[PDB]
Amino acid sequence: VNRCIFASIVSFPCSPDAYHDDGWFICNNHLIKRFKMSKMVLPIFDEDDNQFKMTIARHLVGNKERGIKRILIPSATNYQDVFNLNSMMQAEQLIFHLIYNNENAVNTICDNLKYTEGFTSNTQRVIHSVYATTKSILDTTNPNTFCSRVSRDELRFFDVTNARALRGGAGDQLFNNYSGFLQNLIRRAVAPEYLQIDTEELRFRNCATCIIDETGLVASVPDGPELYNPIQPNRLQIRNVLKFEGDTRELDRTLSGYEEYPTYVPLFLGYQIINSENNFLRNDFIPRAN
Amino acid sequence: VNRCIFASIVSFDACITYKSPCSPDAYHDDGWFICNNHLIKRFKMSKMVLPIFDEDDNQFKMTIARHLVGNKERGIKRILIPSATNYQDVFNLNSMMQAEQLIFHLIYNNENAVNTICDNLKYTEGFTSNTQRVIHSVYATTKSILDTTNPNTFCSRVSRDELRFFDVTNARALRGGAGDQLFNNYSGFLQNLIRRAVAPEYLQIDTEELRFRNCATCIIDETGLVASVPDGPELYNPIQPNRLQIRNVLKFEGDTRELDRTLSGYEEYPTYVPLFLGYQIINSENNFLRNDFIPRAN
Amino acid sequence: VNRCIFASIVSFDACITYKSPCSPDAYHDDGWFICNNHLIKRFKMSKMVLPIFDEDDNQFKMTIARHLVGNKERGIKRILIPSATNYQDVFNLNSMMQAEQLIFHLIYNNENAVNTICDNLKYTEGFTSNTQRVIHSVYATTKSILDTTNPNTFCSRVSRDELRFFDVTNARALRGGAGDQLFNNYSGFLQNLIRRAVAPEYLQIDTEELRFRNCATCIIDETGLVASVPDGPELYNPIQPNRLQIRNVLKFEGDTRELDRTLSGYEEYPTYVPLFLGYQIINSENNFLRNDFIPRAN
Amino acid sequence: VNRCIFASIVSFPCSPDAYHDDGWFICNNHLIKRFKMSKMVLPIFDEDDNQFKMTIARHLVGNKERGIKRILIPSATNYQDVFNLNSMMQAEQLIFHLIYNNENAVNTICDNLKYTEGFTSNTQRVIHSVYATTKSILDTTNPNTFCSRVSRDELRFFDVTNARALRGGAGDQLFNNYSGFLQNLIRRAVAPEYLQIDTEELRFRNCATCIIDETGLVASVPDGPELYNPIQPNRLQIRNVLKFEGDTRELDRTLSGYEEYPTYVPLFLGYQIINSENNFLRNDFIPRAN
Ligand SMILES: [Zn+2]
Ligand SMILES: [Zn+2]
Ligand SMILES: [Zn+2]
Ligand SMILES: [Zn+2]
């Protein structure tokens, strides 16, 4: 079973990791294509060799990109401007409008395709199949379902100012406006800076690599210049690549043996407070709301 | 496929291995979305087709329901499909299975009672492991049936070919009455159940006005779909192991053997009491004969 | 027979069959009324036997428990058998099974909580059949164990031959103390669990004092049976799937092979920390030699 | 299994119907011996052949009996005077003091037996077996048990003045002071004067034969003279016995064929409302509180 929200794209490409029950409910191909992230894992090791894996995503925005180009997951207000939904297929636009709980756009999409000659046969069935798959995925990721296995186990705050007091900041209250699928995506992509398992607090990164804003999940550092992240057949595009001119074969041969530390920029932000009584090690992917 | 709205009824928590007791007609895609057994048990009706012949031999058949309420029944016992306000009083949902209660609360779009049903089973230990799967399967099946029936879904394949008004005093002017506006308060599934159960007195096809019955055998009121005639006494309609209920039947004592043999060779006219009410105007551009069950709205 | 108070554990929902994780030693009629594994899980201890030899070889063996709490644990984690006031906070009864909640609410005589436990399950459909019997069986077994332990039973074998005090300030005068008055507040099962798990500092068979240990390893306080020493730092005591909990494991990095091989055939003094507290006066007309369990009230 | 309250009688006599699961929880032999009643079945016959059987008792007090001799099930206040518990076995006294919730008498019974030499050896095990059996039976018949299966489908009132409504009289109020076992005994013995299944009131008897007043359930007619009911070793009992001086042989010869209407005096009193939703045909023997 392809557990990808974008696996239902069909005229009116999923990586093999979509079939895995990772909990993202989106394939790495579609994550790269749409949300400018590639799924990774964060192996949290003991001082012994026992480990458990957490899912993180490395954003793929550049150093020079500014403005809406830095938004990873836009808010419901500005997701129209960020994504340019007109270019993508109408099924993709329906999926995106369902993801952001925009009912007016969904109704307009349904109304526009009602006037076509083929709507009655072999089209309405397809649109309803896409709608049903997207709605099932949303309900799986939505904690407000009829009988939802919501978890108060882990308290994931996206502001660390008052997080230790179990409170939240402005970014946390802006995070609640997101839908179930978007909240799950931000939880599975934006790793916590601190992981307060019971009393023990584990600081994974010194500073946050992303900030939740009114524009959405912004891949912008809180201060200073942005980090260096080096990354439609008929479309013409300009990349302005920062080419490195020089002979590096000798240097690469010299330093071959040593382990390579990745230059990726992962998403670390917020505070995670895992309660003493937890069921963290389950792979059923229950909604796990705050 | 078992397209029975009550086929999802299973024991929510107990592992009693309960099975849905509905006939093979559940598998048939007649547009009823309910069995004759389930209709008999709950809505006090039995599904029936109505052969509407031409003046030639060729025929097209319409669905109808034979209401089962007796002559002596009165008060809340006369209602077949209760309204959303008093469906709890009529049905006595407490005595039924929790799956049945959830299905009925979904049928009447009672979100508070559905949430209460979910909450009451949150405390049991089986909810985390097994009960949640069963409850969510029941919810998914019931919601799929409702959405297939509901004309206000995301992309609803609705048809305005026929204009079924349940008040005939002004339906000739293409305007319904108070009963029709009361009929709109019902959910989609109840609307389809009433349309498949209650047949019109007049089946107006283009200019033709085919009056099926003299007067109505059922009336839609704020109380619900009442199986009571508009005037006079009610029509004579002949009719849980641990329960002790009293029927007070009306039994003859005659021989009824030689008389039965005397006229047995002649075709018997059925004595059932089907539901007849409404004015189903049919447009000249109709698509009535198609059997894909397109949900219908007025 | 499996005379373990948690041997009656079972899933109330018949869909899941939960076997009791009960040690083989539970079937013994020692007088613990709790298995080794269950006392390891809750009331953190390991059931031990304390052989009190005579001056010659012949001996009588007593029962004592070793608290499994660590050196670093402080506050609530120190409590092994909590008081009836804060047993809900200490045990986190929400995460435990409903049978465990029932047993623990009966152990502390919290009638309101037990009534709540059956009130929550009274709503589900499965309560009437295959679950009422299960809950009643669990209640009957727990009540039988408690009544066997309860000295206030109808005709109980209450024995005053051995007096067990938990305050040693004035225990020689057969007088109790603050801890003993708190000990009387516990139910019968908790009193027997503490008596079988805690041994006196000063055994006083007849007029012969027998000081078991110099200083107490446990204290009975308002919080409950605390595994905290009277003064100074706590004693060094080395020590649920799908649950992620930190451990703070202390590890030894030495080779230890040569040192271990050096002392080959020398009897190993245990590092376990048993519960020693109180002053168990024994009367000249005692019947301690018996093997039939008795409540043993003051 | 011998589901009889007095089956556990043993020094410190049950009919075969005790083994039957009837809900009486007392055999006919012990009913006659103690409560001056005998078990009977009242077959409630439908107009067509479909019958359900209802339990009933026939009191065995005579025409001339008066005072405490007319009391079938005495109240908790005066059951000592009626039963003369001193003559009975100590096990019988313990059973009766448990049945009437007299904890002080039970404790005194335990205290009297404590001083005996053999109390600890074997006698206490016997007394605890008796106590356990009696208490299990009481809890089975007690609607106020821990979380037993109490049913309110049947509303049985012993005062028909206002029993047509949900209210009750003083006789029903005095009936609540009874213990669980005595309540079940009266429910299974005192058949209703009226049975109302789904607003269909069936009058089994014109006028009552017993009254639940103070001093317990009394086998006395509400008005007029008493009805005519004809009914330990080495004990001299002088009882007045009626006698018919006639031959009474040819008269019995002539009237042989016809069915006999028994001269039994059954117990009919009160109004039993039965709800439309009920499980009256079950055999699980729920306590059936009002
Ligand atoms: Zn995909
Ligand atoms: Zn069915
Ligand atoms: Zn055990
Ligand atoms: Zn008997």
Coordinates of N, CA and C in Angstrom, one line a residue, chain B residues 123-227:
Chain B
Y123 N -12.9 4.2 27.8 CA -12.4 3.8 29.1 C -12.0 2.3 29.1
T124 N -12.7 1.5 28.3 CA -12.3 0.1 28.3 C -10.9 -0.2 27.7
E125 N -10.3 -1.2 28.2 CA -8.9 -1.5 27.8 C -8.8 -2.0 26.3
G126 N -9.9 -2.6 25.8 CA -9.8 -3.1 24.4 C -9.9 -2.0 23.4
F127 N -10.2 -0.7 23.8 CA -10.3 0.4 22.8 C -8.9 0.6 22.2
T128 N -7.8 0.5 22.9 CA -6.5 0.8 22.4 C -6.1 -0.2 21.4
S129 N -6.4 -1.5 21.6 CA -5.9 -2.5 20.7 C -6.9 -3.0 19.6
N130 N -8.1 -3.4 20.0 CA -9.0 -4.1 19.1 C -10.3 -3.3 18.9
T131 N -10.9 -2.8 19.9 CA -12.2 -2.1 19.8 C -12.1 -0.9 18.8
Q132 N -11.0 -0.2 18.8 CA -10.9 1.0 17.9 C -11.0 0.5 16.5
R133 N -10.4 -0.6 16.1 CA -10.5 -1.0 14.7 C -11.9 -1.3 14.3
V134 N -12.7 -2.0 15.2 CA -14.0 -2.4 14.8 C -14.9 -1.1 14.8
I135 N -14.8 -0.2 15.7 CA -15.6 1.0 15.7 C -15.3 1.8 14.5
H136 N -14.0 1.9 14.1 CA -13.7 2.7 13.0 C -14.1 2.1 11.7
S137 N -14.1 0.7 11.6 CA -14.6 0.1 10.4 C -16.1 0.3 10.3
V138 N -16.9 0.2 11.4 CA -18.3 0.5 11.4 C -18.5 2.0 10.9
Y139 N -17.8 2.9 11.5 CA -17.9 4.3 11.1 C -17.6 4.5 9.7
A140 N -16.6 3.9 9.2 CA -16.2 4.0 7.8 C -17.3 3.5 6.8
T141 N -17.8 2.3 7.1 CA -18.8 1.7 6.3 C -20.1 2.6 6.3
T142 N -20.5 3.0 7.5 CA -21.7 3.8 7.6 C -21.5 5.2 6.9
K143 N -20.3 5.8 7.0 CA -20.1 7.1 6.4 C -20.0 6.9 4.9
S144 N -19.4 5.8 4.4 CA -19.4 5.6 3.0 C -20.8 5.4 2.4
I145 N -21.7 4.7 3.1 CA -23.1 4.6 2.7 C -23.7 5.9 2.6
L146 N -23.6 6.7 3.7 CA -24.2 8.0 3.8 C -23.7 8.9 2.7
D147 N -22.4 8.9 2.4 CA -21.8 9.8 1.4 C -22.3 9.4 0.0
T148 N -22.3 8.1 -0.2 CA -22.9 7.6 -1.5 C -24.3 8.1 -1.7
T149 N -25.1 8.1 -0.6 CA -26.4 8.6 -0.6 C -26.5 10.1 -0.5
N150 N -25.7 10.8 0.3 CA -25.8 12.2 0.5 C -25.7 13.0 -0.8
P151 N -26.5 13.9 -1.1 CA -26.4 14.8 -2.2 C -25.6 16.0 -2.0
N152 N -25.0 16.2 -0.8 CA -24.2 17.4 -0.5 C -22.7 17.0 -0.2
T153 N -22.2 16.0 -0.9 CA -20.8 15.5 -0.7 C -19.9 16.5 -1.4
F154 N -18.6 16.0 -1.5 CA -17.6 16.9 -2.2 C -18.0 17.1 -3.7
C155 N -18.0 16.0 -4.4 CA -18.5 16.1 -5.8 C -19.7 15.1 -5.9
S156 N -20.8 15.7 -5.6 CA -22.0 14.8 -5.5 C -22.7 14.7 -6.9
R157 N -22.7 13.4 -7.4 CA -23.4 13.1 -8.7 C -24.9 13.1 -8.4
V158 N -25.5 14.3 -8.3 CA -26.9 14.5 -8.1 C -27.7 14.5 -9.4
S159 N -29.0 14.2 -9.3 CA -29.9 14.3 -10.4 C -31.1 15.1 -10.1
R160 N -31.4 16.1 -10.9 CA -32.7 16.8 -10.8 C -33.7 16.4 -11.8
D161 N -33.6 15.2 -12.3 CA -34.6 14.7 -13.3 C -36.0 14.6 -12.8
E162 N -36.1 14.1 -11.6 CA -37.5 14.0 -10.9 C -37.6 15.0 -9.8
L163 N -38.8 15.6 -9.6 CA -39.0 16.5 -8.5 C -40.0 15.9 -7.6
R164 N -39.6 15.1 -6.6 CA -40.4 14.4 -5.7 C -40.8 15.4 -4.5
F165 N -42.1 15.8 -4.6 CA -42.6 16.7 -3.5 C -43.6 15.8 -2.7
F166 N -43.4 15.9 -1.3 CA -44.2 15.0 -0.4 C -45.5 15.7 0.0
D167 N -45.8 16.9 -0.5 CA -47.1 17.6 -0.4 C -47.7 17.9 -1.7
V168 N -48.9 17.4 -2.0 CA -49.5 17.4 -3.3 C -50.5 18.5 -3.5
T169 N -50.7 19.3 -2.4 CA -51.7 20.4 -2.5 C -51.3 21.5 -3.4
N170 N -50.0 21.7 -3.6 CA -49.4 22.8 -4.4 C -48.3 22.3 -5.3
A171 N -48.1 20.9 -5.4 CA -47.0 20.4 -6.1 C -47.1 20.6 -7.6
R172 N -48.4 20.8 -8.1 CA -48.6 21.0 -9.5 C -47.9 22.3 -10.0
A173 N -47.8 23.3 -9.1 CA -47.1 24.5 -9.4 C -45.6 24.4 -9.2
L174 N -45.1 23.2 -9.1 CA -43.6 22.9 -8.9 C -43.1 23.4 -7.6
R175 N -44.1 23.6 -6.6 CA -43.7 24.1 -5.3 C -44.2 23.0 -4.3
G176 N -43.3 22.6 -3.4 CA -43.7 21.7 -2.3 C -44.4 22.4 -1.2
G177 N -44.8 21.6 -0.2 CA -45.5 22.1 0.9 C -44.7 22.1 2.2
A178 N -45.4 22.1 3.3 CA -44.7 22.1 4.6 C -44.0 20.7 4.8
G179 N -44.7 19.6 4.3 CA -44.1 18.3 4.4 C -42.8 18.2 3.7
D180 N -42.7 18.8 2.6 CA -41.4 18.7 1.8 C -40.3 19.4 2.6
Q181 N -40.6 20.6 3.2 CA -39.6 21.3 3.9 C -39.2 20.5 5.2
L182 N -40.2 19.8 5.8 CA -39.9 18.9 6.8 C -39.1 17.7 6.3
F183 N -39.3 17.3 5.1 CA -38.5 16.2 4.5 C -37.1 16.6 4.3
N184 N -36.8 17.9 4.1 CA -35.4 18.3 3.9 C -34.6 18.3 5.1
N185 N -35.3 18.3 6.3 CA -34.5 18.3 7.6 C -33.9 16.9 7.7
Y186 N -34.4 15.9 7.1 CA -33.8 14.5 7.2 C -32.5 14.5 6.5
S187 N -31.6 13.6 7.0 CA -30.3 13.4 6.3 C -30.5 12.8 4.9
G188 N -29.4 12.6 4.3 CA -29.4 12.0 2.9 C -29.9 10.6 2.9
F189 N -29.4 9.8 3.8 CA -29.9 8.4 3.8 C -31.3 8.3 4.1
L190 N -31.8 9.1 5.1 CA -33.3 9.0 5.4 C -34.1 9.5 4.2
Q191 N -33.6 10.5 3.5 CA -34.3 11.0 2.3 C -34.4 9.9 1.2
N192 N -33.3 9.2 1.0 CA -33.3 8.1 0.0 C -34.2 7.0 0.5
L193 N -34.1 6.7 1.8 CA -35.0 5.6 2.3 C -36.4 5.9 2.2
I194 N -36.8 7.1 2.4 CA -38.2 7.5 2.2 C -38.6 7.5 0.7
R195 N -37.7 8.0 -0.1 CA -38.0 8.0 -1.6 C -38.2 6.5 -2.1
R196 N -37.3 5.6 -1.6 CA -37.4 4.2 -2.1 C -38.5 3.5 -1.3
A197 N -39.0 4.0 -0.2 CA -40.1 3.4 0.6 C -41.4 4.0 0.3
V198 N -41.6 5.3 0.1 CA -42.8 6.0 -0.1 C -42.9 6.2 -1.6
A199 N -43.9 5.7 -2.3 CA -44.1 6.0 -3.7 C -45.1 7.1 -3.8
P200 N -45.0 7.9 -4.9 CA -46.0 9.0 -5.1 C -47.4 8.5 -5.4
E201 N -48.4 9.3 -5.0 CA -49.7 9.0 -5.6 C -49.7 9.3 -7.1
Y202 N -49.2 10.4 -7.5 CA -49.1 10.8 -8.9 C -47.7 10.7 -9.4
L203 N -47.5 9.9 -10.4 CA -46.2 9.9 -11.1 C -46.3 10.6 -12.4
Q204 N -46.2 11.9 -12.4 CA -46.3 12.7 -13.6 C -45.1 12.6 -14.5
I205 N -45.3 12.0 -15.7 CA -44.2 11.8 -16.6 C -44.6 12.8 -17.8
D206 N -43.7 13.8 -18.0 CA -44.0 14.9 -19.0 C -45.4 15.4 -18.7
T207 N -46.3 15.5 -19.7 CA -47.6 16.0 -19.5 C -48.5 14.9 -18.8
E208 N -48.2 13.6 -19.0 CA -49.0 12.5 -18.4 C -49.0 12.6 -16.9
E209 N -50.1 12.3 -16.3 CA -50.3 12.3 -14.9 C -50.9 11.0 -14.4
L210 N -50.0 10.0 -14.1 CA -50.3 8.7 -13.7 C -50.6 8.6 -12.2
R211 N -51.9 8.6 -11.8 CA -52.2 8.5 -10.4 C -52.2 7.1 -9.9
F212 N -51.2 6.8 -9.1 CA -51.0 5.4 -8.6 C -52.1 5.0 -7.7
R213 N -52.4 5.8 -6.7 CA -53.4 5.4 -5.7 C -54.3 6.6 -5.4
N214 N -55.5 6.2 -4.9 CA -56.5 7.2 -4.7 C -56.1 8.3 -3.6
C215 N -55.7 7.8 -2.5 CA -55.3 8.7 -1.4 C -54.1 8.1 -0.7
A216 N -53.4 8.9 0.1 CA -52.1 8.6 0.8 C -52.3 7.6 1.9
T217 N -51.4 6.6 2.0 CA -51.4 5.7 3.1 C -50.4 6.0 4.2
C218 N -49.7 7.2 4.0 CA -48.7 7.6 5.0 C -48.6 9.1 4.9
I219 N -48.1 9.7 6.0 CA -48.0 11.2 6.1 C -46.7 11.5 6.8
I220 N -46.0 12.5 6.3 CA -44.7 13.0 6.9 C -45.1 14.2 7.7
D221 N -44.7 14.1 9.0 CA -45.0 15.2 10.0 C -43.8 15.5 10.8
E222 N -43.9 16.5 11.7 CA -42.9 16.8 12.6 C -42.5 15.6 13.5
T223 N -43.5 14.8 13.8 CA -43.3 13.6 14.6 C -42.3 12.6 13.8
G224 N -42.5 12.5 12.5 CA -41.7 11.7 11.6 C -42.5 11.2 10.5
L225 N -42.0 10.1 9.8 CA -42.8 9.4 8.8 C -43.8 8.6 9.4
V226 N -45.0 9.1 9.7 CA -46.1 8.4 10.4 C -46.8 7.6 9.4
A227 N -47.0 6.3 9.7 CA -47.8 5.4 8.9 C -49.3 5.4 9.3

